């Protein structure tokens, strides 16, 4: 307790007032930790910090459903280049309307 109140982590002080167990994870995967806690209903996960992010149980549920940092950093570049991909897709959508229309007329007969 005193170590934690003098720590940068002091917001966890209300958590340790009762009995407790500290779950330590190096190179974490949270969904895997939640998997086992799911098996036992009376064994609650309360607070925590995942990579400097202080969370309640719901924050752990949120971090769990999340893909890996590799996949997220992978979709980041597509979400950022979406503006250029969309300027080109919309500038090239003008010639594809003609194709879709004429093929829509060849579809009728």
């Amino acid at each position: 307790k005193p170590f934690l109140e003098e720590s940068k982590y002091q917001n966890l002080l209300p958590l340790f007032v009762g009995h407790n167990l500290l779950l330590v994870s190096e190179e974490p995967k949270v969904k895997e930790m939640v998997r086992i806690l799911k098996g036992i209903p009376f064994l609650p996960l309360l607070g925590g910090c995942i990579d400097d992010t202080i969370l309640s149980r719901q924050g752990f549920i949120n971090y769990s459903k999340l893909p890996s940092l590799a996949l997220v950093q992978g979709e980041l570049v597509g979400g950022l280049t979406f503006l250029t991909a969309q300027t080109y897709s919309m500038l090239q959508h003008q010639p594809r309307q003609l194709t879709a229309l004429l093929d829509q007329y060849v579809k009728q007969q």
């Binding site: 003008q94 309307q97 003609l98 229309l101 007329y105």
Partner: peptide
């Protein structure tokens, strides 16, 4: 068909917009 692609290629963007707008109303 060739004179048609030439006459479509000589169209400025507003005239192809109105061409496709009048072809969409079928």
């Amino acid at each position: 068909i060739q004179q048609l692609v030439q006459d479509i290629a000589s169209l400025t963007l507003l005239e192809i917009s109105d061409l496709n707008e009048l072809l969409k109303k079928t």
